[PDB]
């Protein structure tokens, strides 16, 4: 959920 | 390596059961001989059973488990274990995120039945 | 060799799920630290889930599965398997008779959860 | 349950390797269709390889491992694990005494070869 | 998923043994907490033991197996199996080419010893 | 067990 999920997508 | 693909004995009934442990809705596809034979879906962070079914492995015995979460295939881990040369488990874990708990959808295939 | 006894990480949530494949009604006793923490009783010859529950391994981590049919202890087989150094299965089969299919109650413990 | 018996694919080469961790001299017998195909013997408390060999699984593919110490059968534990639906290990531990370490002779069977 | 990484108990002696089944010369590196602790090299298409050694898992318990052929990392597959809650195997297969036999170097880690 | 016999041999 949340943080780690968005960062994985942006990278 | 390829993961989540198992050669079962041909023409043999087996159970397949999926558990969910993720914020994401899991979609678990079970293919026999390269065609969808069951689809389970659900969401839980407490190991809820999102599907259980008996299937037949058909003429090829080829069973494949695929897991998708928000349109992306999850990374899979798997192995088959045989106890007392008789009781078989084909096990799948999957990771939809970054924490690498590999439990986001957990799939257990077991045979023989009955 | 002792079977059905596993040292989980202490104070850790785990799933336990039991399937039945026998004419006999199966009673599955799950002990945490030598005390019964769950019991499942059911009958199926088609791999039905006769129970599923989330438990906690407690301060000792000791988990034990026992299976009986009409009060007679079934013979057990078990192993633990770890995938990608993270995803854990503790597996139990049991034999209540003489055909040695060892599926009469099948018990799968998995962790981590969440 | 019976331990140390595995069904390999028929007529297939496999490796068998034994290690010793005991004050007692280990005798490991490897049977292919119920006839002795190899015997390893040695003593080590430091995991020495007491034998390694390539055998053919024969007509039936049935391979059995037996372990004795000065003629007395050890208690056996075993399982088979398949990785990526291709690489097989058949694993045996054995106990000659009272400490339940099951490493007194450790036997690993692996296939395919080549 | 990461493969070939295992968390052993800290300060525990373990055996590591590697077998080769490939035309390519295999290099097996065993890291203990990210520092090379042993390296085996050899070539066989007949399951020859290319090395066996006893190591200590050290303060972290982290053991990592890396396999290369002339510096090129092979694809790895792995799992850990525990028998009778006591006897541990950490298993690695590796694929240096296209045939997916996963036996090109096979690595077995076993503990406890003695 | 077994150390009894190896010590008898060694000593
Ligand atoms: C003899 C072969 O050697 C390799 C390929 C060529 O080279 C391995 O990947 C194959 O599995 C096989 O063992
Ligand atoms: C967020 O969506 C990531 C996701 O859900 C978490 C609750 C946790 O189960 C995590 O392992 C999973 O990948
Ligand atoms: C009879 O009670 C034996 C029993 O039930 C059978 C239907 C079959 O599942 C068998 O394995 C089990 O021991
Ligand atoms: C005899 O002493 C017991 C025997 O040898 C020990 C050194 C130890 O390896 C033990 O596990 C084995 O059963
Ligand atoms: Ca996850
Ligand atoms: Ca999760
Ligand atoms: Ca039965
Ligand atoms: Ca049955
Ligand atoms: Ca012992
Ligand atoms: Ca020992
Ligand atoms: Ca290869
Ligand atoms: Ca090969």
PDB file of C-alpha atoms and ligand atoms in Angstrom, chain D residues 21-22 99 101 103-104, chain E residues 113-114, ligand 10:
ATOM      1  CA  UNK D  21      28.048 -36.731  11.055  1.00  0.00           C
ATOM      2  CA  UNK D  22      28.299 -39.324  13.868  1.00  0.00           C
ATOM      3  CA  UNK D  99      19.769 -36.656  19.926  1.00  0.00           C
ATOM      4  CA  UNK D 101      19.743 -34.491  14.802  1.00  0.00           C
ATOM      5  CA  UNK D 103      22.389 -35.935  10.197  1.00  0.00           C
ATOM      6  CA  UNK D 104      24.229 -39.100  11.148  1.00  0.00           C
TER       7      UNK D 104
ATOM      8  CA  UNK E 113      26.757 -30.936  11.459  1.00  0.00           C
ATOM      9  CA  UNK E 114      28.447 -33.190  13.914  1.00  0.00           C
TER      10      UNK E 114
HETATM   11 CA1  LIG G  10      24.954 -36.451  14.318  1.00  0.00          CA
END
